[PDB]
Ligand binder design. Structure first.
Ligand SMILES: [Zn+2]
Ligand SMILES: [Zn+2]
Lengths: 147, 122, 237, 380, 168
């Protein structure tokens, strides 16, 4: 740790978390691909809230939906927003990403490409689960603290 | 829980396609030209934290296999003390040391996981 | 290949082996171990179909689930429902002397598989049979102190052989693969129902599922090791 | 009470009885006898019939000695060991010469105390006169005077399916192998491998298998269709014995993609190469693929069902439902002893004795047997 | 001493207790895995630690009564052969056997030897030798120990070669 900082049990926590590699995989419970043609209402009654709520202060009919373990998330310093936007800017402009807010009783993400989509929506699920880094540095798997 | 369906006629595999005029999912055989409607809208399910497999090998004679250990507990159902337990059958690194009992009398499976998330054990 | 594997128990001596070079690659058989010599599998591949063995030709998987598949010397011959009855047959056919005592048979109950072997070169060893068929008591080795005096008898007269013990189902030949499916007791006495401190501490006999019982545990050593006094109060190497 | 239980101190008596009957080298003797009594005869009958000249029963005499300035003498260990003579016995065949447009052949060394060896009968008092020790176990051979022992050769059991994970830097992640072997006659060693390309997270994890005499891996779907099983599902019923296990099935969808280029047995057999190729394929599927089971003709279902079984044990290992197979498990290992060992030789050699007798005919337009091939053969 | 063997026979007995409890805790799924480790890894880690700790305190117990007469203690005091580990393994508990830095694995399916039931992670099962050389090993003990001592022979053979290589 930096000079003056070497007792802050907490500063030791910050760095570790800023170093240790975290993958979407480590937090994802399951992924699914649904046929949801109308982006105004979900065929999945659970995302009704998520969909309306998405207009406060093109897309295909195929949906890539991910569920995140509240625990995996609270443990690693992660937030739906942090996650969501991280994915969001990996594919920049050409993939619609939406997710429930930390408050919701279920952590979820909804993706859509933007003619063979059930394939794109898979070669993409892998890029998400493997390639996409959430927090940390590559190669730095485990990280332990010691006094 | 993605059960897939076959093409009648030439018993081959069906692949999903889109009816852009009435927004509905159609599975179509690409061997011939059969086509049908879909049961559910679910095309793919991955499961990174799978649960299927813990319970496995839970067959009718299980109580006759001697290599299994035996503890006397009460299943939530037939309060009988004839059980034969065993850890998860999932052979992964992160699996837990949770036990799974199988009441020999009523043939019901019950766990020692004081966090029972499963409703159907499997 | 050179580490003393778990299965080596009762077959290969755990201790005897050359130092360094061929260490662990050269082995030694334990006193009571033997090797299968080979038998005709055809008469059994026949018997089977005569008691289920619903021929693999017409195996409708999605119409027959609970059924176990049958293997004879690596060959998948077919499927079979109620294998529990079938096995009891074979078991006695080997203890009647009707099935070559070399042939090994294993039922992976949970795995839903009945595997039978007649291959040559399978190391195996004899074990007491404990099958509990007793009204007076709870489980016990079929051999009784009567079979013994009847054995010691034959020694003094120097008609009750080892083979005689084999055909009356008092003992069996279990190879590694069939061993996967049995619960063996160590001593007969101390394991089928104040303490001298000066004696080694042993675990218990928490078992009412015992299928076999070791003739004697010192029979896991080979020729060399059998000559060491108190090898059990001696450092491993 | 002759019906009472037993004490450990008694098990020793069970042991005296064990040894009183098998001695300390039964493994040896027994192995050998099996060879003599059954294994040998079996070897003579195989590819003996010549295109007729056939070979029938086999007879084995007791140790003999053919010496110049002398007639055939009865040999014994004591003399063999002393004069540096090979202690073997007479080996005679029963030949039949029919005609299409009894006989001596080599010597067979003999394990010292098996059926033949005059010592397998000799009592104690007879051993002494024979200058042989009553304590000798003798599971060895006398050759050129020195006693030779055959060391048990440990090999992996064949005809058993095993699955093994592969190192991270490989293009394959899982494999199912089978050391196919005919327990008798020829005993070919063509191994079958069912590979799973791509690791966890790769796009489209396909399944291809390696067949002998074929320079490429062929996708399971296509091999099934070459075996006469065309329709997906029908094929999948051979692999996934459960319609609810959507996980396994999902893993198989990328396999169905592969064979989506070959929809009929014709092409299925061809892909492996018309005319020429097709017969080349069929043959391989019959007599060179999954040879144990059947090499015949009408058994292409008993095989499709197996290939499936294999692909199944593979997927279980790739779903983390079952562990990799333990290469070091002793039950999937075999020990080739003196018997099976001589057997591997006697074949190679008798094969020649046959292939020569033929050449003896070919050059004789219009008793011709080199007994030296089988004798010098075993000796060397 | 008689009392010393007693204090040792319990030092092990309570050592087994902790192992037992930690198991019940895990079987109930109350174990919280360490960082970067598996529930399974951190269980083994804890169990191994309890046993080595049992082996060491049983040893110091033994080492302590050794009078100034005890010839073995004498050779240890002078510094000519001998060491805690020896007195500890001879006079008190031998220790946990290991192979590849783990306790005896399940070479048999889900088990150590066919004399046990599957899914048995107790100390007896996976390699603990509670007895001393003076007391004698049990068959199950004799074999695991055999498995370990062997690993000690295999790499000793390696360490010998690979070093002679390096040195040259
Ligand atoms: Zn069709
Ligand atoms: Zn019940």
């Amino acid at each position: 740790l930096e000079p003056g900082h070497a007792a802050d049990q907490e500063q030791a926590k910050l760095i570790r978390s800023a170093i240790e590699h975290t993958t979407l995989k480590s937090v994802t419970i399951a992924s699914e691909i649904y046929y949801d043609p109308d982006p105004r209402s979900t065929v999945i009654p659970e995302d009704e809230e998520i969909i309306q709520l998405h207009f406060s202060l093109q897309q295909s009919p195929w949906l890539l939906r991910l569920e995140l373990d509240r625990a995996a998330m609270n443990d690693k310093d992660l937030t739906m927003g942090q996650v969501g936007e991280r994915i969001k800017q990996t594919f920049k402009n050409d993939l619609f990403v939406i997710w429930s807010e930390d408050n919701d009783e279920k952590l979820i993400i909804r993706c859509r490409v933007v003619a063979e989509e059930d394939h794109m929506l898979k070669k993409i699920e892998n890029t998400m689960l493997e390639n996409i880094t959430l927090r940390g540095v590559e190669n730095i798997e485990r990280v332990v603290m010691m006094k | 829980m993605t059960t897939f369906r076959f093409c009648r006629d030439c018993n081959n595999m069906l692949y999903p396609r889109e009816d852009k005029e009435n927004n509905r999912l159609l599975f179509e055989c690409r061997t011939c030209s059969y086509v049908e409607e879909a049961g559910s809208p679910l095309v793919y399910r991955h499961e990174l934290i799978t649960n299927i497999g813990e319970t496995a090998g839970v067959v009718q004679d299980i109580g006759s296999d001697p290599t299994l250990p035996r503890s006397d507990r009460e299943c939530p159902k037939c309060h009988s003390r004839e059980n034969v337990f065993f850890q998860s059958q999932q052979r992964r690194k992160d699996t837990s040391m949770v036990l799974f009992f199988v009441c020999l009398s009523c043939s019901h499976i019950f766990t020692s996981d004081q966090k029972n998330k499963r409703t159907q054990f499997s | 290949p050179r580490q003393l594997h778990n299965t080596h128990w009762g077959l290969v001596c755990p201790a005897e082996t050359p130092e360094g070079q061929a260490c662990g690659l050269v082995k030694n058989l334990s006193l009571m171990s033997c090797i299968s010599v080979g038998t005709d599998p055809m008469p059994i591949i026949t018997f089977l179909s005569e008691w289920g063995m619903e021929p693999l030709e017409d195996y409708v998987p999605h119409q027959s689930p609970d059924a176990t598949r049958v293997f004879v010397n690596g060959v998948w011959h077919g499927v079979h429902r109620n294998p529990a009855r079938l096995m009891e047959t074979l078991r006695t056919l080997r203890r009647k002397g009707d099935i070559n005592p070399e042939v090994s048979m294993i039922r992976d109950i949970r795995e839903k598989e009945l595997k039978i072997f007649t291959d040559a070169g399978r190391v195996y060893r004899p074990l007491f049979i404990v099958e509990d068929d007793e009204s007076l008591g709870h489980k016990e080795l079929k051999v009784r102190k009567g079979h013994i005096a009847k054995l010691m008898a034959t020694e003094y007269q120097d008609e009750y052989t080892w083979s005689s013990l084999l055909n009356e189902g008092l003992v069996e030949y279990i190879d590694a693969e069939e061993e996967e499916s049995i619960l063996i007791a160590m001593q007969p006495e101390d394991l089928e129902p104040d303490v001298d401190p000066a004696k080694r501490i042993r675990v218990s006999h928490h078992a009412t599922t015992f299928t076999h019982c070791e003739i004697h545990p010192s029979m896991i050593l080979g020729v060399a090791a059998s000559i060491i006094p108190f090898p059990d109060h001696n450092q491993s190497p | 009470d002759e019906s009472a239980p037993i004490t450990a101190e008694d098990s020793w008596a069970v042991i005296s009885a064990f040894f009183r009957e098998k001695g300390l080298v039964s493994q040896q003797l027994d192995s050998f006898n099996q060879f003599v009594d059954y294994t040998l005869q079996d070897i003579i009958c195989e590819d003996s019939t010549l295109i007729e000249i056939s070979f029938g029963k086999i007879y084995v005499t007791k140790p003999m000695v053919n010496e110049s300035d002398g007639v055939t003498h009865a040999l014994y260990p004591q003399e063999a060991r002393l004069r540096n003579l090979t202690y073997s016995s007479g080996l005679f065949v029963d030949v039949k010469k029919r005609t299409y447009e009894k006989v001596f052949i080599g010597r067979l060394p003999i394990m010292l105390r098996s059926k033949n060896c005059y010592l397998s009968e000799a009592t104690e008092s007879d051993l002494y006169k024979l200058k042989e020790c009553p304590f000798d176990m003798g599971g060895y051979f006398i050759i050129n005077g020195s006693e030779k022992v055959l060391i048990a050769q440990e090999r992996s059991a064949g005809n058993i399916v095993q699955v093994f994970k592969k190192a991270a830097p490989s293009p394959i992640s899982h494999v199912a192998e089978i050391r196919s072997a005919l327990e008798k006659g020829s005993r070919f060693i063509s191994t079958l491998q069912v590979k799973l390309y791509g690791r966890e997270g790769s796009s489209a994890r396909t399944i291809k298998a390696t067949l002998p005499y074929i320079k490429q891996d062929i996708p399971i779907v296509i091999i099934f269709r070459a075996l006469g099983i065309i329709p997906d599902g029908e094929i999948l019923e051979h692999i996934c014995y459960d319609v609810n296990d959507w996980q396994m099935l999902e893993m198989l969808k990328p396999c169905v993609e592969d064979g989506f280029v070959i929809q009929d047995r014709e092409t299925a057999l061809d892909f492996i190469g018309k005319e020429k190729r097709i017969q080349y394929a069929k043959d391989i599927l019959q007599k060179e693929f999954l040879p144990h089971i059947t090499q015949l003709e009408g058994f292409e279902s008993r095989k499709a069902f197996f290939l499936g079984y294999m692909i199944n044990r593979l997927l279980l290992c790739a779903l983390d439902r079952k562990d990799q197979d333990d290469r070091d498990h002793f039950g999937k290992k075999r020990l080739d002893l003196a018997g099976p060992l001589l057997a591997q030789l006697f074949k190679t050699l008798f094969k020649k004795l046959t292939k020569d007798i033929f050449r003896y005919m070919q050059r004789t337009v219009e008793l011709a047997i080199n007994a030296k091939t089988i004798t010098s053969g075993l000796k060397y | 001493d008689g009392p010393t063997m007693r204090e040792i026979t319990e030092t092990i007995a309570e050592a087994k207790k902790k192992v037992l409890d930690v198991t019940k805790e895990a079987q109930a799924n109350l174990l919280t895995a360490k960082h970067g480790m598996t529930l399974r890894e951190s269980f083994e880690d804890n169990v191994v630690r309890f046993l080595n700790e049992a082996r060491d305190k049983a040893g110091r117990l033994a080492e302590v009564n050794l009078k100034d007469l005890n010839n073995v203690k004498q050779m240890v005091m002078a510094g000519s052969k001998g060491s805690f580990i020896n007195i500890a393994q001879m006079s008190a508990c031998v220790g946990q056997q290991s192979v590849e830095g783990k306790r005896i694995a399940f070479g048999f399916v889900d088990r150590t030897l066919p004399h046990f039931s599957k899914d048995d992670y107790s100390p007896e099962s996976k390699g603990f030798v509670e007895n001393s050389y003076l007391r004698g090993l049990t068959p199950q003990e004799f074999f695991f120990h055999a498995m370990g001592g062997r690993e000690g022979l295999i790499d000793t053979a390696v360490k010998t070669a690979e070093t002679g290589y390096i040195q040259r």
